Amino acid sequence: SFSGYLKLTDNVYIKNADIVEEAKKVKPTVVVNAANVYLKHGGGVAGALNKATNNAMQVESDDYIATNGPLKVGGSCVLSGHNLAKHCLHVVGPNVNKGEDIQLLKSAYENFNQHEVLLAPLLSAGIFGADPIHSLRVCVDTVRTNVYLAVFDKNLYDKLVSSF
Numbered sequence: 001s002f003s004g005y006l007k008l009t010d011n012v013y014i015k016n017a018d019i020v021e022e023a024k025k026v027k028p029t030v031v032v033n034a035a036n037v038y039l040k041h042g043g044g045v046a047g048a049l050n051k052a053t054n055n056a057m058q059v060e061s062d063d064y065i066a067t068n069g070p071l072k073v074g075g076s077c078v079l080s081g082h083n084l085a086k087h088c089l090h091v092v093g094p095n096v097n098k099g100e101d102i103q104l105l106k107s108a109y110e111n112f113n114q115h116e117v118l119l120a121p122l123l124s125a126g127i128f129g130a131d132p133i134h135s136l137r138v139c140v141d142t143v144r145t146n147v148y149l150a151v152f153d154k155n156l157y158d159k160l161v162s163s164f
């Protein structure tokens with residue numbers, strides 16, 4: 001079960017943690033992946049989660065895309081959590097580094113409301129280029145279900161908590 005999290009709101013918790021190590025420890029019902037529309041888990045959170053599954057996440061994802069086509073920015077799909085969780089909710093936040101509308105970040109977080117409890121990264125943060133302080137703000141103002149945020153960088157985690 002989730003431990004060592006700092007409570008930010010009624011339903012939002014945060015921890016300086018590697019989401020892969022956190023998923024391996026917690027084995028949550030849902031781990032959120034910071035996905036792209038093609039489910040190409042190359043780097044960032046997606047690359048790390050996929051590597052932890054021995055590429056099984058990518059094999060499953062390629063079958064999903066072959067059948068369904070790409071996701072929408074702001075959208076999601078539920079796939080297996082493999083060895084990390086029961087399910088992985090692949091959520092596509094806007095990639096500011098590809099010029100995508102930051103306004104889609106709230107739509108991306110709305111996917112979390114379909115799950116009672118989730119282990120997640122900050123959407124659109126990291127290699128997706130958005131301000132993580134903004135991402136946390138949208139998370140707290142959009143997600144109503146119980147979200148346990150894992151923030152990999154200690155320095156960013158401290159900035160997020162101290163500026164909340």
Ligand SMILES: CC(C)C(=O)NCc1nc2ccccc2[nH]1
Pocket residue numbers: 018019020021044045046048051052126152
């Ligand atoms: C499991 C450990 C050894 C690992 O794969 N580290 C690499 C790594 N990169 C990350 C990016 C975002 C979030 C978590 C990330 N982890």
